[PDB]
Amino acid sequence: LVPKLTASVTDGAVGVTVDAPVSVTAADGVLAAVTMVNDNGRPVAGRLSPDGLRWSTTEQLGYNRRYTLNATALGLGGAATRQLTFQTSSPAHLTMPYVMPGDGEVVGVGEPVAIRFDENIADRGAAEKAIKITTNPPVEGAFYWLNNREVRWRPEHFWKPGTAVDVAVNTYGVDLGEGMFGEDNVQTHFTIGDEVIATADDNTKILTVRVNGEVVKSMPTSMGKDSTPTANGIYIVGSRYKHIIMDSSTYGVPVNSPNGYRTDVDWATQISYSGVFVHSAPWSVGAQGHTNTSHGCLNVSPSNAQWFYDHVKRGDIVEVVNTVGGTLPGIDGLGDWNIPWDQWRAGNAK
């Protein structure tokens, strides 16, 4: 018999996707020579298996390239040589994904997996299919989009402490719609730590912190006054700051207006994208535990705010109850758990 060559691409193909390697296989013989080059003549790196049967590229292949593959197979019964030229995808736009939380981080039981693209995603389904989430112990979860750029993945309930979470965003070479392709792959891995849930009850004006179900801190607080109340519901802890100037314009409200403010504060823990923080409030210690005076923030004492900074971490939970406000929006940024599971699981890929 005469050796047979089989490649993963066909001569004259166009729109060849660069999400996978290019390969060539010999049957009834072995591969004696395999080379691939770009349109400038520069060689593409590859590897031939020890048995001589299978060659594959080993580096990232480029968008908008014309590659030429030359292969020869030799066997007892003869020789075959093939030359194949093909063109890879040519994107209209590129989008880079950014994943949170950080690689190697230990996070609380409320932390969703977040993939944020730097451009609007036309094909949300293609984006979801390209994101591989591994959990150990395994748990069911699902994707939901907060806006046109950001998608989240979480389970039905808060995570179990000790769970490993691996996130592979395999978007390089993937058409995310209207010719927007992934700029690159991204990968993160995190772990869930202890269960920490802090409850602010407007009936008592106390912020109680529980760690694995035990009360460890009871903080008198002053939440949003009646005209600018703090919303009820489940908030995920985000960033923390030793000090920060809180600027209402950051959150939609001009400083100079009736509910605007610009205020330098210490020991600030962010709990909503709408600009709710737990923070130090020396001016309101008299009202804390008694009356609501703020713009929405959970005002506590300097030592309590510092304690919160030190002992609460990204992905821990604050639950507000019994205020005169509404409910925090599910799509706030840190309001994900306010979306009922049936609705979340259904998704919004479109």
**177 annotated as belonging to a binding site for a ligand:** no
Residue of 93, 157, 243, 279 marked active site: 279
Task: Enter the resolution in angstroms.
Answer: 1.8
User: Cβ(95)–Cβ(174) under 8 Å?
Assistant: no
**What is the identity of the amino acid at 212?**
N
Three-class secondary structure of residue 260 per DSSP = coil
Place of tokens 């869930």: 192
**Has 110 been labeled as part of a binding site?**
no
Distance, in Å, from the CA atom of 65 to the CA atom of 10, rounded to the nearest integer, reads 15
Angle, CA of 322, 238 and 205, to the nearest 5°: 25
**Amino acid at position 211, single letter:** V
Arch. (CATH architecture) of 90-193+336-350: Sandwich (2.60)
> Which CATH number among 2.60.40.10, 2.40.440.10, 3.40.50.10170, 3.40.50.300 corresponds to the domain 194-335?
2.40.440.10
Is 179 assigned to a binding site?
Answer: yes
Rounded CA-CA distance 339/63 in Å is 39
Structure tokens at 186: 């991204």
CB 283 within 8 A of CB 249: no
- What is d(CA 228, CA 59) in angstroms, rounded to the nearest whole number? 56
Only one residue has tokens 């002992």, namely 311
What tokens appear for 211 in the block? Answer: 């760690």
According to DSSP, the residues that pair with 326 across neighbouring strands are none
DSSP for residue 326? -
**Among candidates 127, 177, 118, which has minimal Cα distance to 153?**
127
Tokens of 240: 């923390």
Q: Is 274 annotated as a binding residue?
A: yes
| Cβ pair 122, 47 in contact under 8 A | no
Q: What determination technique applies here?
A: X-ray
Active-site residue, from 189, 290, 295, 297: 297
The position carrying tokens 């978007």 is 171
Q: How many CB atoms lie within 10 A of CB 34?
A: 22
Q: Does residue 175 contact residue 89 with C-beta atoms inside 8 Å?
A: yes
Longest alpha-carbon distance in the chain: 95
Q: Per-domain residue ranges for the chain? A: 1-89, 90-193+336-350, 194-335
* 175 marked as binding residue: yes
8 A C-beta contact, residue 97 and residue 171: yes
- For the record, the structure tokens of 11 come out as 């001569």
Cis omega (within 30 of 0) for bond into 137: yes
- Number of H helices and E strands in the chain, helices first, is 3, 26
CA atoms within 13 A on the CB side of 25: 4
Compute the distance between CA of residue 250 and CA of residue 168 in angstroms, rounded to an integer: 32
The number of beta carbons lying within 10 Å of the beta carbon of residue 256 is 9
> What residues contact residue 35 under an 8 Å CB cut-off, 6+ apart?
43, 69, 70
Please check whether residue 89 is in contact with residue 63, taking contact to mean a CB–CB distance below 8 angstroms. Answer: yes
**Sign of the CA dihedral running 202, 207, 208, 209:** positive
> Is there a contact between 155 and 140 (Cβ–Cβ < 8 Å)?
yes
243 is catalytic: no
Residue 220, preceding peptide bond in cis (omega within 30° of 0): no
N-terminal to C-terminal alpha carbon distance within the chain: 53
- What stretch of H or E contains 50? none
The 10 Å CB-count burial string (b at 16+, else e) for 179-196 is ebbbbebbebbbbbbebb
> Is residue 157 annotated as part of the catalytic site, yes or no?
no
Among residues 8, 19, 13, 16, which one has the least CA distance to residue 183?
19
